[PDB]
C-alpha cells in the first residue's frame, strides 16, 4: 500500500530562493552544420519545436550550512527539499516559424480540380513549405518524462515477407531527452524507419522521431514521482489538401465505384494528406511568465525532490521566428547580381528559471525505513541516467534566505 508523503514528512518554516541568470541557445533551425572532412559539429541544431528538458541539481541539505541547527536532531532526523513555487521566464518576441522540403512528395491539389491526371511521370516532387501546429506545455517532476510513439514491430515467422510490404506497427514508450522533436501535425511516429523515400515530411523531422507525452501512464504511476504539475495547450487546422505519388500498396475494392473510360480509365491516388496550420499567437493565451504555486499535487508525492534532483520539461512554439542573414562576397559592383550574396538562417532562444524551496525533515523509524527502502533503495544509501542527454542546471551555489530581494519571492510573500 502506498501512502501520501504528508504522513511521514514534516515541513518546517524555512524557505529559500533559487534561480538561473539567463540561458541562451543560437543555432540552425533545420540541420546541424558540420565540417566536410571531420564529424565534429560547428553549429548545433536549435529549433522552436524541440523538447527542452532541464535537469536541476540541488545542494544536499544534510551537508548544507545553516545558521541554525537546533530545529532538528541529526541522530534521528534527515532533511530534504520540497518545491513550492516555479516560474519559467521566457524572452524574445512572439513569432511564427515555417519549414518545408525542396523535394516533397506532392502529386496534385485535390481541394478543387477540373482535369484528370491520366499520365504518370518519373519524378513529381515539389518545393513545399508550411507552418506547424501551435503547442505549449510545461511538466515538473523529480524523474525524467515518458513519451510514446509508433514504431515497427516484430513480424510473425509463419510466412515470409516480400520487399515493399507494409511494416507492422506498435506503440513504444521511451524517455524524453533534450533536443527531441514534438508533434507537428503529422503524428507521433518514427519517420526514419516507417518512411523509405525520405520525401514525405519536412527536413527537420524527416529523419527524427516525434514523441507525445504519456499522460495516462504518468498519472497512473503508484508513487507519482514523474509528474507533480503540468500544463498543456495545443491547436491546429487544415490549410491544403493534396495527393501522394508512388505505387499503390492496397487496391480500392471493385464494389466501391463504377469504372470509367478515356481519361478516367485508371484511378488517381487515394493517399490524401492535409497541411497543418497553427492559427495565431496572442499575448492573452500565454502560459509562461506566470508563477505556479504547488499547493497540492494530484499523486501521492507532494513536491518532495528525492535525491536532490528536479526535472523541468518545456515546449513553446509561440516564439519561433527564424532570422535571415546575408553576406556580401564582393562589394565592387553597383548592379545587383544573385551570385554576389550568400544567405543563412539562424534561430536564437532565451530562458530563465526561478524556484522557491521549503526545508523538510523525516524521522527514520523502522517502519519508515522499510517503506522508503521498498520505495527506492538508493535514498537510504545516499544518506543510472548516464545514457541520456539533458540541459544541466547547477544551483548548488545559488540559494539565498533573503526572499524579498527577488521578483518571485515578493510574490510568494504577497500571496501569504
Amino acid at each position: 500500500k502506498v501512502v501520501s508523503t504528508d504522513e511521514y514528512v514534516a515541513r518546517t518554516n524555512i524557505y529559500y530562493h533559487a534561480g538561473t541568470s539567463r540561458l541562451l541557445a543560437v543555432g540552425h533551425p533545420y540541420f546541424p552544420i558540420k565540417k566536410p572532412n571531420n564529424n565534429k559539429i560547428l553549429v548545433p541544431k536549435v529549433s522552436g519545436l524541440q523538447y527542452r528538458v532541464f535537469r536541476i541539481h540541488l545542494p544536499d541539505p544534510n551537508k548544507f550550512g545553516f545558521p541554525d541547527t537546533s530545529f532538528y536532531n541529526p541522530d534521528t532526523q534527515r532533511l530534504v527539499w520540497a518545491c513550492v513555487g516555479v516560474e519559467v521566464g521566457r524572452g524574445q518576441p512572439l513569432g511564427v516559424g515555417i519549414s518545408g522540403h525542396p523535394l516533397l512528395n506532392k502529386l496534385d491539389d485535390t481541394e478543387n480540380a477540373s482535369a484528370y491526371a491520366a499520365n504518370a511521370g518519373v519524378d513529381n516532387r515539389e518545393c513545399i513549405s508550411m507552418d506547424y501546429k501551435q503547442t505549449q506545455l510545461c511538466l515538473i517532476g523529480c524523474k525524467p518524462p515518458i513519451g510514446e510513439h509508433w514504431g515497427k514491430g516484430s513480424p510473425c515467422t509463419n510466412v515470409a515477407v516480400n520487399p515493399g510490404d507494409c511494416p507492422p506497427l506498435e506503440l513504444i514508450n521511451t524517455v524524453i531527452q533534450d533536443g527531441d522533436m514534438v508533434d507537428t501535425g503529422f503524428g507521433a511516429m518514427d519517420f526514419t524507419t516507417l518512411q523509405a523515400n525520405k520525401s514525405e515530411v519536412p527536413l527537420d523531422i524527416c529523419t527524427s522521431i516525434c514523441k507525445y507525452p504519456d499522460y495516462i501512464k504518468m498519472v497512473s504511476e503508484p508513487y507519482g514521482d514523474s509528474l507533480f504539475f503540468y500544463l498543456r495547450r495545443e491547436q491546429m487546422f487544415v490549410r491544403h489538401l493534396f495527393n501522394r505519388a508512388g505505387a499503390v500498396g492496397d487496391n480500392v475494392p471493385d464494389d466501391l465505384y463504377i469504372k470509367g473510360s478515356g481519361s478516367t480509365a485508371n484511378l488517381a491516388s487515394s493517399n490524401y494528406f492535409p497541411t497543418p496550420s497553427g492559427s495565431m499567437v496572442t499575448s492573452d493565451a500565454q502560459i509562461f511568465n506566470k508563477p505556479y504555486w504547488l499547493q497540492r499535487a494530484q499523486g501521492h508525492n507532494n513536491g518532495i525532490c528525492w535525491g536532490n534532483q528536479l526535472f523541468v520539461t518545456v515546449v513553446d512554439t509561440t516564439r519561433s521566428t527564424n532570422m535571415s542573414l546575408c553576406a556580401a562576397i564582393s562589394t565592387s559592383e553597383t548592379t545587383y547580381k544573385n551570385t554576389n550574396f550568400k544567405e543563412y538562417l539562424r534561430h536564437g532562444e532565451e530562458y530563465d528559471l526561478q524556484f522557491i524551496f521549503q526545508l523538510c525533515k523525516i524521522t527514520l523509524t523502522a517502519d519508515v525505513m522499510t517503506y522508503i527502502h521498498s520505495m527506492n533503495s538508493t535514498i537510504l544509501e545516499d544518506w543510472p541516467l548516464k545514457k541520456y542527454t539533458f540541459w544541466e542546471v547547477n544551483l548548488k551555489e545559488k540559494f539565498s534566505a533573503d526572499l524579498d530581494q527577488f521578483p518571485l519571492g515578493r510574490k510568494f510573500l504577497l500571496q501569504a
Partner: antibody
Amino acid sequence: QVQLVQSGAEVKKPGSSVKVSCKASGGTFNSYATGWVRQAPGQGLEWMGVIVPIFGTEDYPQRFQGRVTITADESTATAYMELRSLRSDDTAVYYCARSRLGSSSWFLFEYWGQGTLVTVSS
Amino acid sequence: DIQMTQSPSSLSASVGDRVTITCRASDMISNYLNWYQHKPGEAPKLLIYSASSLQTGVPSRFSGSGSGTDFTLTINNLQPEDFATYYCQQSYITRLSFGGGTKVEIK
C-alpha cells in the same frame, strides 16, 4: 537496347496450370504497364489481361476471369502469367507486351517478347 | 466491352499502289485507336497510336485518320516489306480488344 526474353515451350495435360515468364535484359527498364496476348493456330490475336501497378489497375476479359493471373516483379523486372484449368483450346503462342515509364501513355506497347508455344494435349 | 470490325478481311495489291483499311467501333471511343503490324514468325509491331500519331522509326508512307466510331489506315507507295497482317486495337477502357485483321497479299 532492351530485349525481352521469354521461357521455353510447354507441354501440359488438361486440367493442369501453366506459368510463363518475361524478363527484361538490357539497361534499366522501370516498367509502366504489362499485358499478355495470344494467337491460336489459324486465328487472330486475343488480349488476355493487363496490369498497371501504378494507379493500381488489374483487369482481365470476362471470358478469362478466374483462370488468368498476371504479376510483375520490379526488383528483377520480370513478368509472370498464370493459367489455371487448361483446356485443349489453349494450345497457342503467347506474347508479352510491356510499356516503359516516361512515355506519353500507358498503352504504348513498344516492347514485345519472342513468344512461347504452349501445347495442351494427352 | 467494345467490339471492333475491320474491313476488308483480305486484299491483293501490287508494288506502288495505295491501300486503305477501314475500322469501325461499337461505341464512341474518341481517338483511342492503335494499329499493329504482324508478320509470320515475329512479334507484333506498333505503327500508329492515337489514330493520328506516327511511331518513331516508321516510314511516312503510313498514315491514319478518324474519330468517333470510324477510323482508317492508309499506305501509299506499297513496298515489298509492307505485306503483312494489320490489326486495330481500342484502348478506351482497360479491357482492351483487337480487330479481325486484314491480310495484304501480292497480286
